[PDB]
Design a binder for these strands. Structure first.
Ligand SMILES: [Mg+2]
Ligand SMILES: [Mg+2]
Ligand SMILES: [Mg+2]
Ligand SMILES: [Mg+2]
Ligand SMILES: [Mg+2]
Ligand SMILES: [Zn+2]
Ligand SMILES: [Zn+2]
Lengths: 205, 52, 70, 36, 67, 100, 137
RNA sequence: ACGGAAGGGCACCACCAGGAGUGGAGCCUGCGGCUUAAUUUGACCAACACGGGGAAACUCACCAGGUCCAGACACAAUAAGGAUUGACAGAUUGAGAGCUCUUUCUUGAUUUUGUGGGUGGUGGUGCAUGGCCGUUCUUAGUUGGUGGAGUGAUUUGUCUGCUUAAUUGCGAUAACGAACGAGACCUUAACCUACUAAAUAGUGGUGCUAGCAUUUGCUGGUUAUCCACUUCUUAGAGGGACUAUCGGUUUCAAGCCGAUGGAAGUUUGAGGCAAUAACAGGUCUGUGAUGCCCUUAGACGUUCUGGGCCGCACGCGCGCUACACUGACGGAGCCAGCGAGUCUAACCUUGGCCGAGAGGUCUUGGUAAUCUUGUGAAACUCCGUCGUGCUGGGGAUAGAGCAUUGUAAUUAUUGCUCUUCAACGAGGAAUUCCUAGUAAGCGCAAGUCAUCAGCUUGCGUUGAUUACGUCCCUGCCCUUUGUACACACC
């Protein structure tokens, strides 16, 4: 059917996204984009580091193509992956969440890592950022530390339109810490979709 | 070998969430086969969105 | 894991010619999709091969993706 | 609790896939091979 | 209630502060030039601004009002 | 010539109408006759679930929606051009099924 | 020549053609709408403007989609709108205006469709506003 | 921050005016209690038809029992002269179980055994957590820059008053100019004889022309039967409302109240999203999310059999059916909308046939605006029987028989036919929800589903009464004030 076909395609995309999130974490994975063409299925994965995805001249790309092939029962040659560098750099909430997770896993003060992430996001053109760290920073009542810089909206369609939100579970030797990153991109340099706020009224003379 | 399988072709034990393997809160509409919590988590990822 | 030696040789044959195997987490599956052995043998024999290296296991919604190393 | 008595140093039936190493066990009137 | 917020009242006020030798006290022609002299991102907000501008113009001819 | 029916289906309205217009224009520059693109009603795959991952709190329900929008365009053309029309439609997100 | 009428969800399509006073509702005469009490509710747009007043027009409605009363109101307004549109197109404009004024001076949504639509139901209770009964102890 | 001080304000989770009720009866369901081998457990406004929790098996986590390692991997030892595995037949067992034994085959370095070290857990900790969610909050609150006040922490801005749903705005004024929230926004339900296009939608007329009437008129019918179109329907792009106009009331206005026009004048109706934050609120019983603890081969892992979760002196909550004539029953009228539905195979089912019924059989259409389906729903309407009675209202309890689903209906799954016809004569103290297509009545689709609704989520049918306010009660917010609190009244 069609009702089932598109739901299955959405589940297929979700499965690929979770698979690449678990697999290519050290590769700076940012997002999957399946392009189902009649001839072949061009799944394009967008990561910040598209050389650790290639490996030894395409070994890792080949093995990832074969992994998705042998999971989703395709005919050899009817699917292919494509590693792509994200034109959207640390403006990307998932990329910054993974950066913070890796800094907190290899060892870095929580406040310093959050400030570094916020500084990088802001200096990369972003119109506002917010990083929330919830859990046992040092074994306690598990307070939640917020670090927000700039302008941010929280309600209405604009939050879907221009806001990127990502959460991440960091697992240290004491409990689990939730890392939430909210990046508000500047609507003026959107290059697609609405280019201003709904209430932004500009007059000329 | 001949005792390790009671038949599970129907009922709540026949199907599990494709993500978390839970037999409760399963959503079998449109062939999702996802637990009612895992679907809330990965809802935007499938194409289901909140409008009203 | 008590598996016919031969029954493990085909596992390594397939795993080495292809380089990838995606085993559904079904301990009762009578036969694996790609290898003519039960998925229980596939998963646990390979798990045993993952404790010596040369195999990395990801789960990704209960499907046991295995990739070899060099 | 499989004891597996040591079985220290020591015919043929149907199901011809047997490779003539399936010598029958004789308790009484046992015409079924070692396999089946 | 039908009270108008800042984004309507201030926008209408500025529209009068820069377009007095302009749109009359009729809403139909008040909303038309709003599209060319203002980049409103929703027709409902445009209608709200044009209506408040019309009201302000209708009450400006009977005594100057603050601001 | 061969009479066919091209069915376009997707959840993105802009991306679906992009191909639903590209096909029409690519048949106009080739000057065929077609029964205009028919817009079958959008199917809202609404699904209601419980907000709570547990059994505590006010009983709050939330419905998600998947709007499947479908369209169908029937025309006639020979093989060499109908294949070009079925190869122009590569829009990501829209699936295209041709039936003879 | 072709008008419509809706009350809540029922839609009645009226075809007004040059003819001789044939008023059909579903293939039957107007005397067989049969709620047995709203027959005068379907008689309203005739006795309002003119007793017969019409040997030149024929009205044929077809109604579907609602309930009994919704369809009755839908036809009672569809035939009135068909008469108004017929006078608008062919017969006369001052006649149309006088007959529309006569309709509006008795207006029971004979000319304008009722705007009331069913309010969506919200969780936590049957109906759009009524809530499930709550107990404290 | 709190207070058991005060003052303002808001609110059908408060009231006033009312409607429907509940509480009274029976039954369904959940909770407690009690019982039990187990009656698994979480939860006590913001628990109690809640865990999408409608449990025969499974789910299952409880109980009585029974198998297996699915104990990685070192490492030793066992072992290439055999470490280990499986076994037909009998005892044993519920079991056609090589579990264990009577017995001797079979396989062959994969594992027994240690030895470390893994792994799993619906085991504990929601007072160690993440995420999510609920509540505060169907509330309006929160915060920079410059300036002013203070030595300073800080304060004003962020307010006497009015208005608003709103820190909504007017206005007042050491503030001015702004930001988050509100609003804007998005979705949907309204209209649009306007644009586009539709044998997957409909309407007009041509031949196919069966009926009635017979000067051609009504309704009929023609899924490959012609032409034209989009009024009905669909959905893209747009339009439309912005409280428009006109009066009155405003102190100066924001606004409010009426009338007219309008499709729509109560944020146009309803939702989604929703700031600073606070709770030791719920969830480790969703998670291959998880710290720590417990267990880990007589397992708390996993599996199988059976039972239990439903168990009954009793109390409570959400509900269904009623107490009848504005009704019951029998014939007839035959009117929706939201939706779902099978290609690796068993779903929605049209039609024919059999049957009193449930239901059974042969096909058909549908992977779907095509077929189920026009969901020929119910309430409702008409005409009859009943005659106000513990009655023909009411259908609790039980017996017999017939089918369906299911490996398996006993503790009745459910449906069907017959038969007994229990309380209940309008429900005390108390108490819930609700202001217009809303309450209420009524049914339908979906979810849970192999089967099972009295549950929920939506949908549509019929459509009131009363009110257009208030702080009397309750709850909350703000302000003032007290503090010996700051781990902030635990
Ligand atoms: Mg909002
Ligand atoms: Mg267990
Ligand atoms: Mg202040
Ligand atoms: Mg129970
Ligand atoms: Mg339930
Ligand atoms: Zn799940
Ligand atoms: Zn043999």
């Amino acid at each position: 059917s069609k009702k089932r076909k598109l739901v299955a395609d959405g589940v297929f995309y979700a499965e690929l996204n979770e698979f690449f999130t678990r697999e290519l974490a050290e590769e700076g994975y940012s997002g999957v984009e399946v392009r189902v063409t009649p001839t072949k299925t061009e799944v394009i994965i967008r990561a910040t580091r598209t050389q650790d995805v290639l490996g030894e001249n395409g070994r890792r790309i080949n093995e990832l193509t074969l992994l998705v092939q042998k999971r989703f029962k395709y005919a050899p040659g009817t699917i292919v992956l494509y590693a792509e560098r994200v034109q959207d750099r640390g403006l990307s909430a998932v990329a910054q969440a993974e950066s913070m997770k890796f800094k907190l896993l290899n060892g870095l003060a929580i406040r310093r890592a959050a400030y570094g992430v916020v500084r990088y996001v802001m200096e990369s053109g972003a119109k506002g950022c917010e990083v929330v760290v919830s859990g046992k920073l040092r074994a306690a009542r598990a307070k939640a530390m917020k670090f927000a810089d700039g302008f941010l909206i929280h309600s209405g369609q604009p939050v879907n339109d221009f806001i990127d939100t990502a959460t991440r579970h960091v697992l240290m030797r004491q409990g689990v810490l939730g890392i939430k990153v909210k990046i508000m991109r500047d609507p003026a340099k959107s290059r697609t979709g609405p280019k201003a706020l709904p209430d932004a009224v500009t007059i000329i003379e | 070998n001949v005792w390790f399988s009671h038949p599970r072709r129907y009922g709540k034990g026949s199907r599990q969430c494709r993500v978390c393997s839970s037999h409760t809160g399963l959503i079998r509409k449109y062939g999702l086969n996802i637990c009612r919590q895992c679907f809330r988590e990965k809802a935007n990822d499938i194409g289901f969105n909140k409008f009203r | 894991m008590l598996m016919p030696k031969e029954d493990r040789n085909k596992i390594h044959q397939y795993l080495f010619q292809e380089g990838v195997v995606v085993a559904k987490k079904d301990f009762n599956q009578a036969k694996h999709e790609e290898i003519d052995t039960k998925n229980l043998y596939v998963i646990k024999a390979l798990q045993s091969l993952t404790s010596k290296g040369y195999v990395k296991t990801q789960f990704s919604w209960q499907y046991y993706y295995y990739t070899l190393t060099e | 609790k499989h004891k597996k008595v040591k079985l220290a140093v020591l015919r043929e039936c149907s199901n011809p896939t047997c490779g003539a190493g399936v010598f029958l066990a004789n308790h009484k009137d046992r015409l079924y091979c070692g396999k089946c | 209630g039908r009270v108008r917020t800042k984004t309507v009242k201030r926008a209408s006020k500025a529209l009068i502060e820069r377009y007095y030798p302009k749109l009359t006290l009729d809403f139909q022609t008040n909303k038309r030039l709003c599209d060319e002299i203002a980049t409103i991102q929703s027709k409902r907000l445009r209608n709200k601004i044009a209506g408040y501008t019309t009201h302000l113009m209708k009450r400006i001819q009977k005594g100057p009002v603050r601001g | 010539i061969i009479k066919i029916r091209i069915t376009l289906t997707s959840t993105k309205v802009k991306q679906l109408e992009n191909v639903s217009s590209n096909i029409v224009k690519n048949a106009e520059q080739h000057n065929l006759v077609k029964k205009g693109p028919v817009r079958l009603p959008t199917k809202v795959l609404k699904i209601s679930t419980r907000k709570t991952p547990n059994g505590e709190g006010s009983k709050t329900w939330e419905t998600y929606e998947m709007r499947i929008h479908k369209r169908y365009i029937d025309l006639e053309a020979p093989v060499q051009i109908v294949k070009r029309i079925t190869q122009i439609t590569i829009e990501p997100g829209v699936d295209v099924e041709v039936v003879v | 020549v072709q008008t419509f009428g809706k009350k809540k969800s029922a839609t009645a399509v009226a075809h007004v053609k040059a003819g001789k006073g044939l008023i059909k509702v579903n293939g039957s005469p107007i005397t067989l709408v049969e709620p047995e009490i709203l027959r005068f509710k379907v008689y309203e747009p005739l006795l309002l403007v003119g007793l017969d007043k019409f040997s030149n027009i024929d009205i044929r409605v077809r109604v579907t989609g609602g309930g009994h009363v919704s369809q009755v109101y839908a036809i009672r307004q569809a035939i009135a709108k068909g008469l108004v549109a017929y006078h608008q197109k062919y017969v006369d404009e001052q006649s149309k205006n006088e007959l529309k004024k006569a309709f509006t001076s008795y207006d029971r949504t004979l000319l304008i469709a009722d705007s009331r639509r069913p309010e969506p139901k919200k969780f936590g209770g049957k109906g759009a506003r009524s809530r499930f009964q709550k107990s404290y102890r």
